[PDB]
């Protein structure tokens, strides 16, 4: 694996939280990692790493940082430019990432856009964060269990389909691995448990993805965001927030998440520096 | 590089699809081509049965009219519908190979939905023909509103284009949606319907041509396996009327939009007028 695309149809589902945690995990494993954020208007992942750089500079602390590549001098402005200019910016950034880094992580916003399609076309691994609800699963398609046939494809699944096509047309013979990461919801109703399980399994089979565990929504992530820090950075020497058992829980979820992506052996580790910081 | 493989399909099977398919077949026959017909609606087989009816009627009479090479996938295609996918695929491949060896045009009537054989038929298409009734609800079969929701039928065509390109065929596949005007259509909706189909055409990658109005005359000809082009003073097991001449004119415009005018028999004593 070198190109990892984190994508879903409508954003959310902790996508950038997952993206930036994958980045720091791979950095701690000793890789050179590039990060490209194709959510040009919101730039959640790119801003996270801008915060990391600023905070580290302010504290004169060193932690691993990625090569963060913008598409232009002003990516918020680029969002309103014609597609061809967004594509050009992406191609130049991607060229630099491939020349300089071992892993390239691309955080992508979904929609019907050239750059999202092109990013998925470069992906060795597509990571799709998905909340555990019926309305969210609709973004992957609709499969009968009237038969188990596809009845309605989704826009996002078409994006992935288009990516696999670009990849093959380009002469890359290795298959792209597509993992939907299911985020469990605190609100999930008992009446829906069996059908939620069965629906996602039916979609996995017909649409062509496999299922892994995501991250539960937690306020701890938004509290870390302004510092550009991930769970893996926290220690007695690095704790601008109180470290709690929430952080240790999140760390375990990330272990299982990374395992499902096939990336365990590339991560930093997961004495215990996080427990030490409690 | 000339059109050889024509795949007629839609999502739900209505919209005069079999009527259109069999009229394309006889037009191309009258134009001097050998034509194969393969019907992948395995349970209903409307087009296959049309040509079985034709054979039976011509045999009963002592009459020669052109007939296609009508190829089944098995000894019992209705039974085949319930068999494992790989058996359907095998039957399709064997039929298609025979058609390609023996015929100039191959017309495949397909039911859509999510089957290997419908995908494979589209993968072999030079021209995809999609009969579609003129309404907002019908157009949803092609997708929705940028694109927000793709449709299964449109994905099947896109998949076909991909298979074609993967096979080393560099010529593009042509895809025409044939818009059947409805008698129920109110005049006030004309522009809204037009704008909707044009937006879908642009994003989904099809072009639009005119279809065939629903008419009782087709149901009346079906038992005899006859199309408009067959009717004459010598061939009229139904009373010929101005409806049949109207249908003939519709077929002309349809065939023209498909790029098939120069291959048709003739959509000189007007034999249809003579039969009135």
Author numbering:
A (entry chain B): 4 to 273, 280 to 287
B (entry chain A): 2 to 146, 152 to 273, 279 to 287
Task: Share the article's original sentences.
Protein gradients play a central role in the spatial organization of cells, but the mechanisms of their formation are incompletely understood. This study analyzes the determinants responsible for establishing bipolar gradients of the ATPase MipZ, a key regulator of division site placement in Caulobacter crescentus. MipZ dynamically interacts with the polar ParB-parS complexes, forming a subcellular gradient with concentration maxima at the tips of the cell and a minimum at the cell center. It inhibits polymerization of the tubulin homolog FtsZ into the so-called Z ring, a structure that forms the basis of the bacterial divison apparatus (Erickson et al., 2010). MipZ belongs to the Mrp/MinD family of P loop ATPases, a heterogeneous group of proteins that act as nucleotide-dependent molecular switches (Leipe et al., 2002).
The two independent structures show excellent agreement with a root-mean-square deviation (rmsd) of 0.44 Å. Superimposition of the structures reveals that MipZ, Soj and MinD share significant similarity in the region constituting the nucleotide-binding site, with an rmsd of 2.4 Å across the 176 α-carbons forming the backbone of the conserved core. However, MipZ differs from its family relatives in the arrangement of several conserved loops. In addition, it displays a number of unique features, including a marked extension of helix 2 and a large loop between helices 9 and 10 (helices 10/11 in Soj). Notably, helices 6 and 7 of MipZ correspond to a single helix in both Soj and MinD (helix 8 in Soj). At the junction of these two helices, MipZ exhibits an unusual structural motif, consisting of a large loop that is stabilized by a short antiparallel β sheet (S6/S7). Together, these distinct characteristics are consistent with a clear evolutionary separation of MipZ from its two relatives. MipZ has no C-terminal amphipathic helix, as used for membrane attachment of MinD, and lacks the conserved DNA-binding domain characteristic of plasmid-encoded ParA proteins (Gerdes et al., 2010). Interaction analyses showed that MipZ monomers bind to ParB irrespective of their nucleotide state. Monomers are unable to interact with the nucleoid and, consequently, display high diffusional mobility, thereby rapidly returning to the polar ParB clusters.
